[PDB]
């Protein structure tokens, strides 16, 4: 990748800067770094999945959903976009949408699904049940 050697190095540098910010709970800075990384190289779903996580840590779930949906569109075989979508939907009180997203994680990963991925799916399913049970007039 000679033509985009500078572009890719810069996008990955920005990504790493955003990841350090995320580790330090500087979610505002992480978001700005991931946003610049996407501008430099907009074909990498990881940057959108990372930005979705930062938005969710700030309880900015509408923006997290948008970024997760972008990650899914850019790489539909990448499970993490669906995990980020499911977390944001779950936190928004949309557990049926979260369940579908976490189920897709399990379908993608198949027999390679981790116990944490299974727990995510089961948590969403439980929240569907809880939400129904809590209905009042
Ligand atoms: O547009 B909302 O995510 O239902 O508030």
Q: Rounded to whole angstroms, how far apart are CA atoms 66 and 38?
A: 14
Query: Which of helix, strand or coil describes residue 101?
Result: helix
Does the beta carbon of 62 lie inside 6 Å of ligand 1? Answer: yes
Which of 104, 44, 38, 37 lies closest to 74, judged by CA? 44
Ligand 1 closest atom vs CA 92:
3
Does the beta carbon of 63 lie inside 6 Å of ligand 1? Answer: no
Element (H, E) at 54: helix 45-57
C-beta separation of 124 from 95 below 8 A: yes
Q: Rounded to whole angstroms, how far apart are CA atoms 83 and 119?
A: 12
Resolution for this experimental structure (Å): 1.5
Class of the CATH-defined domain 1-137: mainly alpha
C-beta separation of 60 from 52 below 8 A: no
Q: What is the token pair recorded at 61?
A: 């779930």
Based on its alpha-carbon atoms, the radius of gyration of the chain, rounded to whole angstroms, reads 16
Give the alpha-carbon dihedral of 4, 15, 86, 55, to 10 degrees: -130
Instruction: Determine phi and psi for 76, rounding to 5 degrees.
Output: -70, -10
Q: What is the token pair recorded at 129?
A: 């049940």
Residue ranges covered by each domain of the chain: 1-137
């Amino acid at each position: 990748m000679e033509d985009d050697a500078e572009t890719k190095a810069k996008a990955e540098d920005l990504k790493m800067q955003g990841n350090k910010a995320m580790a330090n709970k500087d979610y505002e800075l992480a978001i700005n770094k991931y946003t610049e990384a996407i501008k430099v190289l907009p074909t990498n779903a990881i940057y959108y999945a990372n930005r979705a996580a930062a938005h969710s840590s700030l309880k900015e779930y509408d923006q997290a959903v948008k970024d997760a949906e972008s990650a899914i569109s850019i790489d539909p075989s990448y499970f993490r976009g669906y995990s980020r979508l499911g977390f944001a939907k779950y936190a928004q009180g949309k557990p049926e949408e979260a369940l579908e997203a976490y189920k897709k994680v399990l379908d993608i990963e198949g027999d390679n699904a981790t116990e944490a991925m299974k727990r995510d799916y089961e948590s969403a399913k439980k929240k569907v049940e809880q939400s129904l049970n809590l209905e009042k007039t």
